[PDB]
Amino acid sequence: SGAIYVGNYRVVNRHLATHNDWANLVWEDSSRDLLVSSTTAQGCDTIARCDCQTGVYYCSSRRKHYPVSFSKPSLIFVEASEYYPARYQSHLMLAVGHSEPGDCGGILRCQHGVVGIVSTGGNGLVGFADVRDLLWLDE
Ligand SMILES: COc1cccnc1CN1CCC[C@H](C(N)=O)C1
Ligand SMILES: [Zn+2]
């Protein structure tokens, strides 16, 4: 679990979005595993606008943060789960690191701000849904 809170927006994994997220929907994209909903309170986070390929992510199944080197956002095949059919997920960045399904929502940060959220993984890999291209999150 986990979310990004920026301005009057809440960014979550689309497959973990709640009934309240869908009732206050701003934008969603199944191919990215992202959903953004509106909030009444001002958020705590800020978004990176950069090309960093290193950063630190929070891993809830270890209660720890780990440093990672990750690939640039790209189209990556993701196997079927109870949430999606087997498909290509876009804007995904892969790294070597521990992750389990419940780790989705953990934030990846670089020195500039939030980069994305945990969305995929297994077998010593962890994948992050990028949010740096969503410029409207800041307006
Ligand atoms: C950290 O995520 C892990 C780890 C291990 C195994 N499965 C996942 C996530 N997995 C299941 C939920 C939907 C997700 C997706 N974006 O399609 C894929
Ligand atoms: Zn950066």
Curated annotation (Swiss-Prot):
This is Protease 2A. It comes from Coxsackievirus A16 (strain G-10). It catalyses: Selective cleavage of Tyr-|-Gly bond in the picornavirus polyprotein. Homodimer. Cysteine protease that cleaves viral polyprotein and specific host proteins. It is responsible for the autocatalytic cleavage between the P1 and P2 regions, which is the first cleavage occurring in the polyprotein. Also cleaves the host translation initiation factor EIF4G1, in order to shut down the capped cellular mRNA translation. Inhibits the host nucleus-cytoplasm protein and RNA trafficking by cleaving host members of the nuclear pores. Counteracts stress granule formation probably by antagonizing its assembly or promoting its dissassembly. Zn(2+) 1 binds at residues 50, 52, 110, 112. Disulfide bonds: none annotated. The active site is at residues 15, 33, 104.
